[PDB]
Amino acid sequence: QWALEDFEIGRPLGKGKFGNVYLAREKQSKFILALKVLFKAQLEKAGVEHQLRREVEIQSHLRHPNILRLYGYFHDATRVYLILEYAPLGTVYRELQKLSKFDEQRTATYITELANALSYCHSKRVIHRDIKPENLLLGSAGELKIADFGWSVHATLDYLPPEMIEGRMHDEKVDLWSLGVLCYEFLVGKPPFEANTYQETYKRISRVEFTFPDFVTEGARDLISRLLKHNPSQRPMLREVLEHPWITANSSK
Numbered sequence: 001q002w003a004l005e006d007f008e009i010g011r012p013l014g015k016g017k018f019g020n021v022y023l024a025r026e027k028q029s030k031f032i033l034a035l036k037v038l039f040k041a042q043l044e045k046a047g048v049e050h051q052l053r054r055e056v057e058i059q060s061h062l063r064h065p066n067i068l069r070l071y072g073y074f075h076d077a078t079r080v081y082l083i084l085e086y087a088p089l090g091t092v093y094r095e096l097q098k099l100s101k102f103d104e105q106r107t108a109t110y111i112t113e114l115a116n117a118l119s120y121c122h123s124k125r126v127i128h129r130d131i132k133p134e135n136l137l138l139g140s141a142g143e144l145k146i147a148d149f150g151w152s153v154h155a156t157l158d159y160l161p162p163e164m165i166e167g168r169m170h171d172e173k174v175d176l177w178s179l180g181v182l183c184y185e186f187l188v189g190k191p192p193f194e195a196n197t198y199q200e201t202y203k204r205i206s207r208v209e210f211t212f213p214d215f216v217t218e219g220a221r222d223l224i225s226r227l228l229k230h231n232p233s234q235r236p237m238l239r240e241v242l243e244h245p246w247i248t249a250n251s252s253k
């Protein structure tokens with residue numbers, strides 16, 4: 001199907017691990033989209049070959065307003081190319097760097113959009129596992145879109161749960177933890193388990209050792225405390241999250 005000469009390449013949108021993402025336009029269509037360039041060299045050296053196969057396989061088959069479309073793909077000699085939906089308003093990450101904290105209505109809305117997207121993922125038995133602000137994009141209307149199914153599976157420590165950090169076997173429940181960490185970070189402006197070293201953060205995650213600044217409301221504290229439980233079993237379902245007083249009270253969607 002596609003080849004590189006099918007597109008005009010535009011400005012760099014940002015840098016990734018094995019490659020960078022560019023603005024691009026399909027020549028015939030004048031259709032605007034993001035082009036993710038990966039290097040066969042680096043992805044072999046790190047043997048993530050099998051993961052890319054799952055990202056491409058998984059993201060290509062998902063269809064949801066809050067999940068970033070993968071349209072197709074291709075490759076040449078040196079590189080692999082992902083042809084992605086373009087998200088005009090950037091990452092939630094840069095949004096967070098700019099504003100410092102989010103208000104309770106912006107947070108609740110993102111959490112809602114996120115839950116929906118995740119509630120759908122799980123019904124198709126897909127677990128993301130790598131949910132973080134660099135991996136959340138914004139659509140033309142400012143709607144949240146989950147991107148980059150990198151370590152997603154049909155089955156740096158800041159957003160991972162105790163069970164994963166400690167090697168153990170994990171389920172759809174990892175994502176509700178990540179959701180808890182996100183909810184906290186949106187309101188406070190830094191993740192609950194942040195530290196100067198990986199080693200400290202690890203201990204802090206395993207003991208679920210976090211505290212709230214004074215400005216965080218009882219509603220926020222309750223939802224977050226429910227999501228951030230050491231025991232996967234004790235975490236709410238996506239459905240209960242959507243129904244949380246604090247959420248329904250504050251969310252616009």
Ligand SMILES: CS(=O)(=O)NCc1cccc(-c2cn3c(Cl)cnc3c(Nc3ccc(N4CCOCC4)cc3)n2)c1
Pocket residue numbers: 013014015016021034036084085086087088089090091094137147
């Ligand atoms: C500070 S930052 O925003 O550059 N963060 C860096 C970074 C790292 C990895 C992947 C991306 C990335 C991936 N995308 C995919 Cl895939 C589809 N659309 C985008 C997409 N879109 C996008 C749209 C507009 C903007 N800006 C920059 C400053 O504010 C005005 C417009 C940036 C990224 N970005 C961005």
